[PDB]
Symmetry: C4
Subunit: 393 residues, 4 copies
């Protein structure tokens, strides 16, 4: 597993971690994390399914979208607060569920992302994983603010009793909503992870029931008063099905590219979906969230302009928590918050409600390309232009 | 040819081959093979025609297709079995014909891919090349299961007697079908191959460059075995095949080893099936595709577009070369699981349910060639940097 | 900040600067500058907002446009002079406002770009920044030719008195126009800049984030100088500008230093001019563009799409920093010749003849984002190799 | 200029030149040439205008075109001969004019490309440059076969007398056609070249008259009986003008990307042009040639399928001539000849006349793209999948 030279090196790098407020963007936590986490943790956290195409595409598709900002608009004041699943929130984003947080943060785990989401002036919703390291009660008890909200992400067990009880329990504990994950009926093949464990129905586990169906969701809807959100939808047809059975929302997601490879970028699915919901006379019947590859405030703004109620982030927070703990999570939150406010100003709007599609240039949303392979001989032999040089010393 | 240093190094690497069950995907057999095979074998197996554009494009075109998976579907059970050329098969894929397998596996050659296809719980169809190292007899005799099926890939000889006899022979031996290759009337230029050995020359009397449709029509009369035209590259020829009544075609370009700039078979498949329907030829033909298939999801996409089966060449060749029969069996297991695992996440439970509504085909045509790089602008530009650790 | 090793190295490189007439293109000044400026100056000048996507896109979008040149046309004589904001100018381009020029040129700052714009045979308009290092007076006083024109770029202060006075002042001083910048109500995040120094903070009372159209309408009444709204990024705002009657706009995003993912001004220009015509606003406004312009052909494309003038920021900044006033003059000569030389090959003889039929705009919209690289497939693949020389 | 270490090194590499028949493709001559030619020659030959975008695009646009080959066709026999400007030729390609051939081949210059074009079984047309190193008569006299044809490329001089006489002269000498170049009224800026000479109307030279117009061509048409071809056309409007004044043809060209940068790939201009010539009832009134970036037989086949009468090549032959002389040129010719025949067989046709557009897939001819710039931080921090490794020795 983790060698002595591995351990020795990382321990030394951890003492050279730069001061938390020298961290400029979310990628910085990722770099530091990639150098300090154990092989196992890094592998667990950073991997995606198979070739990890979807994992990267989730992020790159945001780049097929450009802005059409308004100028000469009074932008002295800006408000990025909004509402999600019935609760008022300070920001348009949230921490999505990430199992085994103790892998990167052994002592605090999820309790630290909870403190991170409520200890600062900006209280951010935290989605709690079913497969979390810590227990539900300790995670919820660690929340430092009564104003902060927490959501419980649920995997339905083959043993429904366990699930029914867990729901009664988290509801008693005070979570504001249930996100039931449906994109993992089977475990995705994360190969970086698999290589380390060298130091078909095997992907199924009764812990997560591969037989979950819409009927099952309809019944769950009857057993609880908590808003229900179907997490992991990847096509418009299922957003419509969700709206028709009456759940509160869906999160357009592919599990951060950790499940089906070649699932589309949720931002693209979002673009296709909202207009169709209007055509089907389902506008606003559902609250639609997206996650995957979101790393910049402008990523969030694009999602909001296309109609997302909220934008989730997984890995960035995981890395912040692992390298700097609760304070890292708070920092991450501050960085994202500011990127959103500053770009909203430049966009020329002053509130989340004003983020609409006419602010986006969607004309090239479909330019997802695959180039003809490189003419290696032609390019190898070719010699490009060179810059002028300084005089010989 | 193969030097002493070459031999010394490779022999040592072969003893460091990792344990067969540490092999995660098809690319792993390729990497190992590339470091252990002889220059000649590697060059022979890994090369494509001219600039090898099509060889790579065959694979890359699969990436112009995305999935539109169904969720909240009972995927506890999944079945990837199907039927090809009248026979029931455990999987939707097969081993395509690859001549000279003894180059990578000197002792067993094709006999080892045969054992690999039937020695495990999953019996996979094996297409036997005309130019195989081993004899038809010994390759078919090597098959360990009576349930496994074998197909014979045929090159029509200028000497038709030789061909007529070979057909009677393989038919007597029990092969379930005849795949007659039509994309190699002349040998493509594999330059990696040629460098090592340092236009009427591309024609050999072995493969008759004069083969025409009439010839196929007559072959149809001389045998009872289903006939499949291997190497179709345009819709017009799929239609001609359906019209002369053969059993199927395999949309292929010889793994990019023949005409460079032939399109990705997956693309030709996407264009073809709808046209077959319009021409009232739906299901008259069984359509297979090969070329650049390396992941289960590649296979699923082909199946959703209507392919009856998906063939793989090189991947199996590499497995056979590095790990022999067990390698082939391993490759088979890897592909089998990739297909089942992703079929579940796709939200379907059988090959029949794999249809085009499961695919996002909106960008199938985004095969691009970028404007050349502005080298001075990019060279001088300095991109953003990541934060750094404190100075030790 | 700037270390001893830094200083020692750069001072030595500055004495090895090549002779000014060995400088072939604008990129050469950029390379030299990047090796000689202080970390602070380089970071300040070369940075863009966040990921710097727009900064680069501003330049790259010019490459989505190709030429459809006329041949067999008498191009013995060529004229690239034109008119901007009521004044005749020798060239179709200008020096856009760049604050803190003393960072790269401590002794002369902006006074040196002024001398550069008028000391040669080609007099180029110079836009003077509000945040310049030098004072308005001294920059205008430094102008060596009475024929050269200067424009004042203005940031409206929260304290309008300061602004009203500054306007009376620059107007008295003789500037030919007022460019009021509207794309920086808040300061963009230049991260290269920030690393060296190791959301209401992005607002300074210097640049009033509350500026609106009404404010511009009133400014129009307090001055006789033509007014140009600098920093327009969408067609709706070009139309609003035309409707309130200002003299023009400059399609710009602050050289990618403000909102990341704002589009390439050239693209916004292509979309805008035809719409202005449809709205019966043809010629009511003079439209300028800036951002990523580095070659004469970039300028020609902007002109063919209807731009009245094309501005350049960084290129001139780099020339001024490395070679001072003479560098600016050199840059001016380089761009001047690139424009004339390519206008001849384009087959036209004057700025007026630069129209869109000279451009191929069919792929203007091919701004793409590729599917991520299949790393295993590409890593394992071995491309063709070139023949080699005999073994020595 | 050329240093002692430069000279010493190159002289040694020239003795290590591999045997001529070990040369597999045109790129091989380019590599060898790039290592053996003098700085000056290489710079002169390999450079294009400004950023050299068009130079590379000329070649890459061929890659936006794919084949739709016919199978089950008797392809035992194949014929790649055709006719150009009234003469029967063994191949569908030719050597385009390249000034100063003595730069790469000091002793023989153009005389060697002439011997190379006629000494073998395949006689290839040779276009002779006005700015050639050798004299017209010696170049024409060096032709070893009476069956081989030569064309004279003309630059019209400000002093028309000189031009009128030169035409009378080359016509007396026996050239079969006049290609008058019109894409160089002014000299393009080849910067690799300029850098070496450190070891506005300055681009004009009365030697090449910048005032040439259509009228001038009409009159030239009256002063000679040789077919005239306007070399350097870059838009459809001028192909139509040429057809209307009655010249024999045009060569869709941009001077190998050595003149206007951002001129289009001639193959693309060809695709657009031929259909328009038919619509305008001008089909076959003109013979249309293309040049630029052609390096493979399939490049040639694509051009022919789109209606080109012949395909020219510049640099490849220049490099072959420079490194191996007359025999190199002959080799180059053999390589191209075979690539064309072998791929024609696989295409499923047996003669040049059968090369038509239904053999091409033109659906993506317009996918000439410019990607959104790279998200450097995201890609830098990302860590891709790795291949399995051999056991530790
Ligand atoms: C290490 C890791 C563990 C995760 N565990 C869960 C989980 O237990 N339940 C769940 O619903 N989603 C899980 N997710 C998915 C996230 O909730 C979310 O979809 C994803 O992280 C968003 O992508 P991003 O990481 O690119 O922002 C996990 C993601 C990661 C990276
Ligand atoms: C080394 C090698 C030898 C081959 N020999 C034959 C052959 O004799 N007959 C035939 O029909 N196809 C032959 N093929 C082509 C395959 O049947 C198949 O079309 C191709 O390998 C599919 O491409 P892939 O390798 O990317 O999967 C050969 C391919 C390779 C790589
Ligand atoms: C270092 C620097 C300082 C600038 N300062 C100003 C300013 O004070 N006012 C303004 O209107 N624009 C300012 N700009 C933007 C320029 O006027 C112009 O829009 C931009 O430089 C054009 O982009 P380019 O550098 O790629 O040519 C500045 C640009 C740079 C690079
Ligand atoms: C070094 C060099 C010199 C050239 N000289 C001439 C010339 O004197 N006259 C002319 O009409 N074309 C000239 N050309 C252009 C060629 O005739 C032809 O257009 C070009 O080489 C085709 O591009 P390619 O080199 O990529 O094949 C020259 C090209 C090169 C590379």
């Amino acid at each position: 597993g983790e060698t002595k030279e591995d351990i020795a090196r990382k321990e030394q790098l951890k003492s050279l971690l730069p001061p938390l407020d020298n961290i400029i963007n979310l990628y910085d936590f990722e770099y530091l994390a990639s150098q300090t986490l154990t092989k196992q943790a890094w592998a667990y956290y950073s991997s995606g399914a198979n070739d990890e195409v979807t994992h990267r595409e989730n992020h790159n598709a945001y780049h097929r979208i450009f802005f059409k900002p308004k100028i000469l608009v009074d932008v002295r004041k800006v408000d990025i607060s909004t509402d999600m699943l019935g609760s008022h929130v300070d920001v348009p984003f949230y921490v999505s569920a990430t199992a085994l947080c103790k892998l990167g943060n052994p002592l605090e785990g999820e309790k630290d992302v909870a403190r991170g989401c409520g200890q600062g002036v900006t209280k951010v919703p935290q989605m709690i994983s079913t497969l979390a390291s810590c227990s539900p009660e300790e995670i919820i008890e660690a929340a430092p603010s009564d104003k902060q909200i927490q959501w419980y992400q649920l995997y339905v067990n083959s043993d429904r009793k366990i699930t029914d009880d867990l729901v009664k329990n988290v509801e008693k504990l005070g979570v504001k909503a249930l996100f039931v994950t449906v994109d993992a009926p089977s475990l995705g093949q994360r190969e970086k992870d698999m290589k380390l464990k060298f130091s078909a129905s095997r992907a199924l586990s009764k812990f997560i029931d591969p037989s979950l169906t819409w009927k099952d969701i309809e019944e769950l809807k009857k057993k609880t008063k908590l808003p229900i959100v179907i997490k992991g939808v990847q096509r418009t047809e299922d957003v419509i099905k969700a709206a028709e059975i009456g759940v509160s929302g869906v999160v357009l997601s592919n599990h951060g590219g950790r499940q089906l490879d070649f699932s589309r970028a949720p931002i693209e699915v979002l673009a296709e979906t909202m207009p169709i919901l209007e055509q089907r006379n389902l506008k606003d019947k559902l609250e639609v969230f997206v996650d995957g590859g979101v790393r910049r405030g402008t990523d969030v703004l694009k999602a909001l302009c296309l109609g997302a109620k909220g934008v989730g982030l997984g890995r960035p927070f995981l890395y912040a928590n692992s390298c700097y703990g609760r304070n890292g999570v708070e920092k991450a939150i501050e960085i994202l918050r500011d990127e959103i406010e500053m770009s909203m100003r430049l966009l020329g709007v002053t509130s989340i409600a004003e983020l609409k599609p006419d602010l986006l240039d969607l004309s090239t949303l479909k330019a997802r390309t695959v180039g003809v392979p490189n003419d290696v001989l032609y390019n190898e032999v070719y010699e490009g232009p060179t810059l002028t040089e300084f005089e010989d010393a």
